Design an enzyme around this catalytic site. Structure first.
Site, PDB file in Angstrom:
ATOM      1  N   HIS A 210      32.521  66.455  39.462  1.00  0.00           N
ATOM      2  CA  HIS A 210      32.535  66.773  37.999  1.00  0.00           C
ATOM      3  C   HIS A 210      32.041  68.192  37.706  1.00  0.00           C
ATOM      4  O   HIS A 210      31.101  68.416  36.927  1.00  0.00           O
ATOM      5  CB  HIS A 210      31.742  65.713  37.239  1.00  0.00           C
ATOM      6  CG  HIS A 210      32.456  64.418  37.111  1.00  0.00           C
ATOM      7  ND1 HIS A 210      32.120  63.346  37.856  1.00  0.00           N
ATOM      8  CD2 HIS A 210      33.515  64.047  36.361  1.00  0.00           C
ATOM      9  CE1 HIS A 210      32.927  62.346  37.561  1.00  0.00           C
ATOM     10  NE2 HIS A 210      33.788  62.748  36.636  1.00  0.00           N
TER      11      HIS A 210
ATOM     12  N   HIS B 229      37.022  70.880  38.696  1.00  0.00           N
ATOM     13  CA  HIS B 229      37.655  69.734  37.973  1.00  0.00           C
ATOM     14  C   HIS B 229      38.147  70.213  36.596  1.00  0.00           C
ATOM     15  O   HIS B 229      39.277  69.938  36.212  1.00  0.00           O
ATOM     16  CB  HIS B 229      36.632  68.610  37.885  1.00  0.00           C
ATOM     17  CG  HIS B 229      37.050  67.462  37.041  1.00  0.00           C
ATOM     18  ND1 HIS B 229      38.175  66.731  37.346  1.00  0.00           N
ATOM     19  CD2 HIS B 229      36.570  66.965  35.876  1.00  0.00           C
ATOM     20  CE1 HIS B 229      38.312  65.742  36.438  1.00  0.00           C
ATOM     21  NE2 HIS B 229      37.367  65.884  35.487  1.00  0.00           N
TER      22      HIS B 229
ATOM     23  N   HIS C   2      35.831  69.270  28.868  1.00  0.00           N
ATOM     24  CA  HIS C   2      35.762  67.813  28.661  1.00  0.00           C
ATOM     25  C   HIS C   2      34.617  67.219  29.461  1.00  0.00           C
ATOM     26  O   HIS C   2      34.235  66.122  29.122  1.00  0.00           O
ATOM     27  CB  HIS C   2      37.105  67.141  28.964  1.00  0.00           C
ATOM     28  CG  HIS C   2      37.324  66.865  30.390  1.00  0.00           C
ATOM     29  ND1 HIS C   2      37.652  67.846  31.266  1.00  0.00           N
ATOM     30  CD2 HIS C   2      37.208  65.717  31.090  1.00  0.00           C
ATOM     31  CE1 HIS C   2      37.766  67.305  32.478  1.00  0.00           C
ATOM     32  NE2 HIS C   2      37.445  66.001  32.408  1.00  0.00           N
ATOM     33  N   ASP C   3      34.136  67.864  30.508  1.00  0.00           N
ATOM     34  CA  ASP C   3      32.996  67.302  31.299  1.00  0.00           C
ATOM     35  C   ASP C   3      31.800  68.270  31.329  1.00  0.00           C
ATOM     36  O   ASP C   3      30.975  68.220  32.270  1.00  0.00           O
ATOM     37  CB  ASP C   3      33.432  66.977  32.705  1.00  0.00           C
ATOM     38  CG  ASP C   3      34.064  65.580  32.917  1.00  0.00           C
ATOM     39  OD1 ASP C   3      33.633  64.615  32.305  1.00  0.00           O
ATOM     40  OD2 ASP C   3      34.868  65.440  33.853  1.00  0.00           O
TER      41      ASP C   3
ATOM     42  N   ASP D 151      42.923  63.945  33.199  1.00  0.00           N
ATOM     43  CA  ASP D 151      41.593  63.701  33.804  1.00  0.00           C
ATOM     44  C   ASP D 151      41.747  63.073  35.173  1.00  0.00           C
ATOM     45  O   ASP D 151      40.883  63.343  36.050  1.00  0.00           O
ATOM     46  CB  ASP D 151      40.751  62.808  32.921  1.00  0.00           C
ATOM     47  CG  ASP D 151      39.276  62.904  33.234  1.00  0.00           C
ATOM     48  OD1 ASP D 151      38.886  63.876  33.903  1.00  0.00           O
ATOM     49  OD2 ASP D 151      38.534  62.085  32.679  1.00  0.00           O
TER      50      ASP D 151
ATOM     51  N   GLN E 193      40.584  51.814  46.197  1.00  0.00           N
ATOM     52  CA  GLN E 193      41.649  52.756  45.751  1.00  0.00           C
ATOM     53  C   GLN E 193      42.901  52.002  45.313  1.00  0.00           C
ATOM     54  O   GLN E 193      43.421  52.319  44.185  1.00  0.00           O
ATOM     55  CB  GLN E 193      41.928  53.814  46.816  1.00  0.00           C
ATOM     56  CG  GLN E 193      40.728  54.739  46.992  1.00  0.00           C
ATOM     57  CD  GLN E 193      40.604  55.553  45.736  1.00  0.00           C
ATOM     58  OE1 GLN E 193      41.433  56.419  45.462  1.00  0.00           O
ATOM     59  NE2 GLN E 193      39.619  55.205  44.912  1.00  0.00           N
TER      60      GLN E 193
HETATM   61  O1  LIG Z   1      38.526  56.275  42.618  1.00  0.00           O
HETATM   62  C1  LIG Z   1      38.195  56.126  41.447  1.00  0.00           C
HETATM   63  O2  LIG Z   1      37.614  54.960  41.093  1.00  0.00           O
HETATM   64  C2  LIG Z   1      38.299  57.141  40.422  1.00  0.00           C
HETATM   65  N1  LIG Z   1      37.688  56.955  39.211  1.00  0.00           N
HETATM   66  C3  LIG Z   1      37.810  58.041  38.293  1.00  0.00           C
HETATM   67  C4  LIG Z   1      37.107  58.126  36.963  1.00  0.00           C
HETATM   68  C5  LIG Z   1      35.857  57.282  36.716  1.00  0.00           C
HETATM   69  C6  LIG Z   1      35.740  58.819  36.667  1.00  0.00           C
HETATM   70  C7  LIG Z   1      38.545  59.256  38.656  1.00  0.00           C
HETATM   71  N2  LIG Z   1      39.267  59.335  39.819  1.00  0.00           N
HETATM   72  C8  LIG Z   1      39.106  58.317  40.734  1.00  0.00           C
HETATM   73  N3  LIG Z   1      39.755  58.375  41.952  1.00  0.00           N
HETATM   74  C9  LIG Z   1      40.209  59.563  42.550  1.00  0.00           C
HETATM   75  C10 LIG Z   1      40.907  59.560  43.810  1.00  0.00           C
HETATM   76  N4  LIG Z   1      41.338  60.670  44.506  1.00  0.00           N
HETATM   77  C11 LIG Z   1      41.054  61.803  43.787  1.00  0.00           C
HETATM   78  N5  LIG Z   1      40.412  61.905  42.586  1.00  0.00           N
HETATM   79  C12 LIG Z   1      39.994  60.819  41.913  1.00  0.00           C
HETATM   80 MG   LIG Z   2      34.182  62.742  32.004  1.00  0.00          MG
HETATM   81 ZN   LIG Z   3      36.826  64.634  33.902  1.00  0.00          ZN
END
Ligand SMILES: O=C(O)c1nc(C2CC2)cnc1Nc1cncnc1
Ligand SMILES: [Mg+2]
Ligand SMILES: [Zn+2]
Length: 313
Positions: free
Chosen positions: A68, A72, A106-107, A217, A269
């Site tokens: 984050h 990002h 946003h973050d 996002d 995943q």
């Molecule tokens: O794996 C996850 O649970 C996941 N969750 C969120 C969000 C909660 C913040 C974002 N991305 C995620 N997976 C993810 C995979 N490979 C790359 N970037 C993100």
């Molecule tokens: Mg966020």
């Molecule tokens: Zn974000």
């Protein structure tokens, strides 16, 4: 006003594609963002002196956390750029301005911990903002930076245009709270299917912008496999730290956050692709057909995780 950012040829071409990776050279990311603002918006949208000062203050207020982080922010802004460029006529002047800024901010000031952890810790932010805790903080930090002397990139909007763009940014940033995405997407699903979706209804456009925010996002799942897989390590480094901090409050964390259950990642995943990512990009593609490359790239990455489980990597 005659000063364009130009990129090298490879980047100038690949930046237009959804699956662009912004690279490991941090010093190029501000320029990449101004390039996108200029092509999305115009060379007039922002005073360059004010925009550069805004960008550098935003960068400084992102922390050195595994996922984050500043990278990002820019990556999410690039997905928004690619959405807006492929849907040229669907969005207003103000919307193009607002959304690239909302994605970059946003973050802001993220600490690498979920709303959930803040509430179990009893963090002061959880008393100040009882839902979408970190997202109301990110919007707070965005307004704080916009009010620094020299940093008001919107100063040349009329008073009513200024109120509209800040309202676009507030809704866009709140929409990145994934707890809200599930019901936003269900509602857009019903509206698209019964045929009541109307992009001239403000409350409908709001919902569609929220879904674009979730899609940008999550866009690390829409990259080429080697990018998605190496990003997934950055996200799990945060999750596993949050898990350690849960164990220090005397709370067994969810398995997603428990470093002792690294084996369960491939199945976690799959659940994430099937419950979150695939439905997000499917509904987005139904509403805005030229975003289909995000859905195609997400499906390819799901198939790569299925290959990890079958021991074939
Ligand atoms: O794996 C996850 O649970 C996941 N969750 C969120 C969000 C909660 C913040 C974002 N991305 C995620 N997976 C993810 C995979 N490979 C790359 N970037 C993100
Ligand atoms: Mg966020
Ligand atoms: Zn974000």
């Amino acid at each position: 006003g005659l000063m364009q950012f130009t990129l090298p040829v490879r980047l100038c071409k690949e930046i237009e594609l959804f699956h662009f990776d912004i690279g490991p050279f941090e010093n190029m990311w501000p320029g990449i963002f101004v390039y996108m603002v200029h092509r999305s918006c115009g060379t007039s949208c922002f005073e360059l002196e004010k925009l550069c000062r805004f960008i550098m203050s935003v960068k400084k207020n992102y922390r050195r956390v595994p996922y984050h982080n500043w990278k990002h922010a820019v990556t999410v802004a690039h997905c928004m750029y690619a959405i807006l460029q492929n849907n040229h006529t669907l969005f207003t002047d103000l919307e193009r301005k607002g959304l690239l800024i909302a994605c970059l901010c946003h973050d802001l000031d993220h600490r690498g911990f979920s709303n959930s952890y803040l509430q179990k810790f009893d963090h002061p932010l959880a008393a100040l903002y009882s839902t979408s805790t970190m997202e109301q903080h990110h919007f707070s930090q965005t307004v704080s930076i916009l009010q620094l002397e020299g940093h008001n990139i919107f100063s040349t909007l009329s008073s009513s245009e200024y109120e509209q763009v800040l309202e676009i940014i507030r809704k866009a940033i709140i929409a990145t709270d994934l707890a809200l995405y599930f019901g936003n997407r269900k509602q857009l699903e019903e509206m698209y299917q019964t045929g009541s979706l109307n992009l001239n209804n403000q409350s409908h456009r709001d919902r569609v912008i929220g879904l674009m925010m979730t899609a940008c996002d999550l866009c690390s799942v829409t990259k080429l496999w080697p990018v998605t897989k190496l990003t997934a390590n950055d996200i799990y480094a945060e999750f596993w730290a949050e898990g350690d901090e849960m164990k220090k409050l005397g709370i067994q964390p969810i398995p997603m956050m428990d470093r002792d259950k690294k084996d369960e990642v491939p199945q976690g995943q799959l659940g994430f692709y099937n419950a979150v990512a695939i439905p997000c990009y499917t509904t987005l593609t139904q509403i805005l057909p030229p975003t289909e490359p995000l859905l195609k790239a997400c499906r390819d990455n799901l198939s790569q995780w299925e290959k990890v489980i079958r021991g074939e990597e």
